[PDB]
Design a protein around this ligand. Structure first.
Ligand SMILES: COc1ccncc1CC(=O)N1CC[C@H](C(N)=O)C1
Ligand SMILES: [Zn+2]
Length: 139
């Protein structure tokens, strides 16, 4: 679990969005596994605006932050799970690292700020849903 809190927005994995997030929906995209809902309070996370390919992510299944190298956002085949059938997920970045289903929501950060959140993984990989292209998160 986990979310990014920037301005009056809350960014979560779409598959983990609550019925309360859908009522307060701003934008969602099933192909990216993202949902953004509006908040009453102002958030303080800064979104990165960069092309960094190294960063640090939080892994809740190890209670540890790990440094990683990750691929640029791309269209990647993601195996079936209880939340989606087997499909291509867009704007996804992969790294070699540990992840379990419940690690979704953990933040990936670089020197510039938040890059994205854990969204996919298994078999020694971890995938992150990029948020750096969502320029409107800053307004
Ligand atoms: C961190 O994800 C995992 C880690 C280990 N085995 C499996 C997984 C993958 C997983 O459970 N999901 C839930 C839906 C999500 C998606 N974006 O399609 C992928
Ligand atoms: Zn960066």
């Amino acid at each position: 679990s986990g979310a990014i809190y920037v301005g009056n927005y809350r960014v979560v994995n779409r598959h983990l969005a609550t019925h309360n997030d859908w009522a307060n929906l701003v934008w969602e995209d099933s192909s990216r596994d993202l949902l953004v809902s509006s908040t009453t309070a102002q958030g303080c996370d800064t979104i990165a605006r960069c092309d960094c390919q190294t960063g640090v992510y939080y892994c809740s299944s190890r209670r540890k932050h790990y440094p990683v190298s990750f691929s640029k956002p791309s269209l990647i085949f993601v195996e079936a799970s209880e939340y989606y059938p087997a499909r291509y997920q867009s704007h996804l970045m992969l790294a070699v690292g540990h992840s379990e289903p419940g690690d979704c929501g953990g933040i990936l950060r670089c020197q510039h700020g938040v890059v994205g959140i854990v969204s996919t993984g298994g078999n020694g990989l971890v995938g992150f849903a990029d948020v750096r292209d969502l320029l409107w998160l800053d307004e």
